[PDB]
Design an enzyme around this catalytic site. Structure first.
Site, PDB file in Angstrom:
ATOM      1  N   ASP A  21       1.025  -1.190   0.316  1.00  0.00           N
ATOM      2  CA  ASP A  21      -0.193  -0.212   0.271  1.00  0.00           C
ATOM      3  C   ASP A  21       0.583   1.088   0.068  1.00  0.00           C
ATOM      4  O   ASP A  21       1.786   0.917   0.607  1.00  0.00           O
ATOM      5  CB  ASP A  21      -0.979   0.457   0.957  1.00  0.00           C
ATOM      6  CG  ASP A  21      -1.928   1.331   1.503  1.00  0.00           C
ATOM      7  OD1 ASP A  21      -2.337   1.701   0.814  1.00  0.00           O
ATOM      8  OD2 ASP A  21      -2.275   1.952   2.162  1.00  0.00           O
ATOM      9  N   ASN A  23      -1.540   4.611  -0.283  1.00  0.00           N
ATOM     10  CA  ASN A  23      -1.873   5.793   0.373  1.00  0.00           C
ATOM     11  C   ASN A  23      -2.714   5.592   1.656  1.00  0.00           C
ATOM     12  O   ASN A  23      -3.397   6.093   1.807  1.00  0.00           O
ATOM     13  CB  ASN A  23      -2.517   6.144  -0.950  1.00  0.00           C
ATOM     14  CG  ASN A  23      -3.615   5.044  -1.216  1.00  0.00           C
ATOM     15  OD1 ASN A  23      -3.665   4.117  -0.850  1.00  0.00           O
ATOM     16  ND2 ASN A  23      -4.655   5.499  -2.004  1.00  0.00           N
ATOM     17  N   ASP A  25      -4.734   3.423   2.434  1.00  0.00           N
ATOM     18  CA  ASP A  25      -6.213   3.161   2.674  1.00  0.00           C
ATOM     19  C   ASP A  25      -6.508   1.528   2.780  1.00  0.00           C
ATOM     20  O   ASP A  25      -7.348   1.079   3.259  1.00  0.00           O
ATOM     21  CB  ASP A  25      -6.789   3.502   1.339  1.00  0.00           C
ATOM     22  CG  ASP A  25      -6.351   2.610   0.233  1.00  0.00           C
ATOM     23  OD1 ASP A  25      -5.206   1.347  -0.121  1.00  0.00           O
ATOM     24  OD2 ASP A  25      -7.180   2.449  -0.750  1.00  0.00           O
ATOM     25  N   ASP A  29      -1.601  -1.378  -3.639  1.00  0.00           N
ATOM     26  CA  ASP A  29      -1.777  -0.666  -5.325  1.00  0.00           C
ATOM     27  C   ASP A  29      -0.799  -0.547  -6.144  1.00  0.00           C
ATOM     28  O   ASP A  29       0.765  -1.413  -6.176  1.00  0.00           O
ATOM     29  CB  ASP A  29      -1.680   1.188  -4.737  1.00  0.00           C
ATOM     30  CG  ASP A  29      -1.256   1.191  -4.117  1.00  0.00           C
ATOM     31  OD1 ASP A  29       0.399   1.190  -4.112  1.00  0.00           O
ATOM     32  OD2 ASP A  29      -1.422   1.783  -2.552  1.00  0.00           O
ATOM     33  N   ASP A 199      -8.325 -17.734 -15.951  1.00  0.00           N
ATOM     34  CA  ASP A 199      -8.549 -18.295 -14.643  1.00  0.00           C
ATOM     35  C   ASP A 199     -10.202 -19.473 -15.324  1.00  0.00           C
ATOM     36  O   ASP A 199     -10.783 -19.437 -16.308  1.00  0.00           O
ATOM     37  CB  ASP A 199      -9.364 -16.873 -14.357  1.00  0.00           C
ATOM     38  CG  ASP A 199     -10.326 -17.157 -13.036  1.00  0.00           C
ATOM     39  OD1 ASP A 199      -9.432 -17.784 -11.553  1.00  0.00           O
ATOM     40  OD2 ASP A 199     -11.487 -16.922 -13.021  1.00  0.00           O
ATOM     41  N   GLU A 253      -5.570 -22.195 -16.284  1.00  0.00           N
ATOM     42  CA  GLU A 253      -5.877 -22.565 -14.470  1.00  0.00           C
ATOM     43  C   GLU A 253      -7.234 -23.688 -14.800  1.00  0.00           C
ATOM     44  O   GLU A 253      -8.319 -23.430 -14.619  1.00  0.00           O
ATOM     45  CB  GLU A 253      -6.749 -21.774 -13.599  1.00  0.00           C
ATOM     46  CG  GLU A 253      -6.706 -22.116 -11.963  1.00  0.00           C
ATOM     47  CD  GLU A 253      -8.149 -21.662 -11.023  1.00  0.00           C
ATOM     48  OE1 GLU A 253      -8.929 -20.802 -11.840  1.00  0.00           O
ATOM     49  OE2 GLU A 253      -8.283 -22.193 -10.109  1.00  0.00           O
TER      50      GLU A 253
HETATM   51  O1  GLC Z   1     -13.149 -23.806 -10.144  1.00  0.00           O
HETATM   52  C1  GLC Z   1     -12.175 -22.276  -9.867  1.00  0.00           C
HETATM   53  C2  GLC Z   1     -12.115 -21.341  -8.329  1.00  0.00           C
HETATM   54  O2  GLC Z   1     -13.535 -22.060  -7.732  1.00  0.00           O
HETATM   55  C3  GLC Z   1     -13.387 -21.665  -6.441  1.00  0.00           C
HETATM   56  O3  GLC Z   1     -12.665 -19.963  -6.551  1.00  0.00           O
HETATM   57  C4  GLC Z   1     -11.806 -22.231  -5.875  1.00  0.00           C
HETATM   58  O4  GLC Z   1     -12.078 -21.971  -4.581  1.00  0.00           O
HETATM   59  C5  GLC Z   1     -10.324 -22.128  -6.748  1.00  0.00           C
HETATM   60  O5  GLC Z   1      -9.619 -22.617  -6.277  1.00  0.00           O
HETATM   61  C6  GLC Z   1     -10.691 -22.461  -8.448  1.00  0.00           C
HETATM   62  O6  GLC Z   1      -9.895 -21.319  -8.463  1.00  0.00           O
HETATM   63 CA    CA Z   2      -3.360   1.895  -1.682  1.00  0.00          CA
END
Ligand code: GLC
Ligand code: CA
Length: 556
Positions: A21, A23, A25, A29, A199, A253
């Protein structure tokens, strides 16, 4: 042909919210990250992966995105993102950003339009269905509690959300939607971004008609959600319309997928992704409900690594990590974080991490041996998934609040999210204000300033291992062979390239142990050891190991 830069690189994951951080808060950042690049450079890091940094209402700390082309308010402005990039480039370092396109915020303009009517041009950017037999369209559950279906009174249909209510799933079946995502990716890649991490990449394709999950599937729903029939068609198209035109590395992921499907994502001939994050290892000791632990041994740990390595084969490539922002701290999880063993076992895990065949990712603060956090009440957790467990298990009477606390203390994502421990000033030098999540009180003993100045520290050992990896090609791209997959005390394996062979030996017991090299193999040189009073003699055919001893040896 030299292998691409990413096969030989060391990454570091930064969770900007909890890193630095500037600033007061209480939230990390961009300016805090940028100010600490000399620290990461000096550790030897080649590349950084930053968790999501886009406009977000933060119901899920950046993973609910309300504008893909703007930066999160808490982290700074586009100028700050640009300055971050320019400062990495000065140091010859690369940036990997997080890409969250399984779902958006319910505050994204697409969703605000989608909800308005069935004939809205944005309607099919999301999934909308009528409920069945008086209730939801089907029995899908959400990872974050209750049904994966949410009723919108504005139309009376339900929308899909695998994750939170405020994270409606994007509809990859709609071509206009896909085209919007590809343009968004190009927006960031045109800025010079060197990498993208996808993700929950395996959940993009949904099952046609959404039938009910069978009782088996229900107990393992994460897996069923990875079985959409258009998954690889979508990933191949994304490569052809986006990645083919740039020089960026892509990492997925692959959460929930059966290990034997992993080759479809990463085999280079398939033109999908470059590398995989898999979860067989990091979840090898997690119950199906995700909040209990099941005890495992080193035999389970090494056997899992072996199978994962085999799936990468000749044309695929793996990441390797022992921690991330969704899991408990590496030393608490895989080593022994008691005060007499924390440092010894953190070093052993470093040796493991930095000697696997694959691209290593070091999660911020593991280079210090940061530990899980001592949660005292349910109010100590920020995590939305813990609220979900509260809803699904406490309010339904399946478990008491105390049973939840006791078990989730060991497993919760918040263990990874406590502020990075810079020094022993107020709040460990993380902030001058009140941190968004409490600093672990062990910061007085575990912090960067103390570690950096000490040549025996965990930090220093990580710095030395990284340097050794950078210098020894077999340690990144050489083959892997487990010397004895059934041994549950001493983890030992070779890494081999162009006639050169290295032996790694790691004691997983807090007790002295012996290791006998295989027949015909002798120690040529000792590269480094942790927690050891003496190197073996040249020609040594066996080793005596202190508790939690690790080492790397050139062998003949
Ligand atoms: O299912 C994919 C995601 O689901 C939830 O966020 C889980 O806690 C994590 O492990 C994963 O990134
Ligand atoms: Ca900050």
């Amino acid at each position: 042909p030299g292998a691409p830069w990413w096969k030989s690189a060391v990454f570091y994951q930064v969770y900007p919210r909890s890193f630095k951080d500037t600033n007061g808060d209480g939230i990390g950042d961009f300016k805090g990250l940028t100010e600490k690049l000399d620290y990461l450079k000096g550790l030897g890091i080649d590349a950084i992966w930053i968790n999501p940094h886009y406009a977000s209402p933060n119901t899920d700390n950046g993973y609910d995105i309300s504008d893909y082309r703007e930066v999160m308010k808490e982290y700074g402005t586009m100028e700050d993102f640009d300055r971050l990039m320019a400062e990495l480039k000065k140091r010859g370092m690369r940036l990997m950003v997080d890409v969250v396109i399984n779902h958006s915020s319910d505050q994204h303009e697409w969703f605000k339009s989608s909800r308005a009517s069935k004939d809205n041009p944005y309607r099919d950017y999301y999934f909308w269905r009528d409920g069945k037999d008086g209730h939801e369209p089907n029995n899908y559950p959400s990872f974050f509690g209750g049904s994966a279906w949410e009723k919108d009174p504005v139309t009376g249909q339900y929308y899909l959300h695998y994750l939170g209510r405020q994270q409606p799933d994007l509809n990859w079946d709609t071509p206009k939607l896909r085209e919007e995502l590809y343009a968004m990716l190009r927006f960031w890649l045109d800025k010079g971004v060197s990498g993208m991490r996808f993700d929950t990449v395996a959940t993009y394709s949904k099952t046609p008609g959404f039938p009910d999950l069978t009782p088996e599937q229900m107990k393992n729903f994460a897996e069923a959600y990875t079985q959409g029939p258009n998954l690889h068609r979508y990933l191949q198209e994304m490569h052809e319309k986006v990645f083919d035109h740039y020089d960026a590395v892509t990492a997925g992921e692959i959460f929930g997928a059966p290990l034997n499907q992993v080759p479809l994502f990463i085999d280079s001939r398939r033109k999908e992704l470059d590398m995989a994050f898999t979860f067989d290892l990091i979840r090898y000791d997690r119950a199906l409900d995700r909040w209990h632990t099941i005890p495992r041994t080193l035999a389970d740990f090494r056997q899992t690594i072996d199978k994962v390595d085999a799936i990468a084969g000749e044309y695929g490539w793996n990441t390797f990590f022992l921690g991330n922002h969704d899991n408990p701290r590496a030393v608490s999880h895989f080593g022994d974080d008691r005060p007499q063993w924390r440092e010894a076992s953190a070093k052993a895990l470093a040796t493991v991490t930095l000697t696997q065949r694959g691209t290593p990712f070091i999660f911020q603060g593991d280079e210090l041996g940061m530990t899980n956090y001592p949660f005292k009440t349910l109010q100590d957790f920020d995590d939305i998934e813990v609220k979900g467990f509260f809803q699904d298990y406490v309010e339904t009477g399946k478990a008491t609040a105390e049973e939840l606390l006791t078990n989730v203390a060991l497993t919760s994502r918040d263990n990874a999210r406590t502020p990075f421990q810079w020094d022993d000033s107020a709040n460990a030098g993380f902030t001058t204000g009140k941190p968004w999540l409490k600093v672990n009180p062990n910061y007085t003993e575990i912090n960067a300033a103390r570690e950096i100045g000490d040549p025996k520290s965990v930090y220093s050992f990580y710095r030395n291992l990284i340097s050794i990896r950078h210098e020894t090609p077999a340690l990144s791209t050489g083959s892997y062979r487990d010397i004895d997959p059934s041994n549950a005390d001493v983890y030992a394996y070779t890494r081999s390239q162009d006639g050169e062979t290295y032996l790694v030996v790691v004691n997983f017991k807090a007790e002295p142990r012996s290791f006998t090299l295989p027949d015909g193999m002798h120690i040529a040189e000792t590269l480094i050891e942790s927690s050891s009073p003496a190197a073996p003699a040249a020609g040594a055919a066996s080793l005596e190991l202190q508790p939690w001893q690790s080492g790397i040896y050139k062998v003949k």
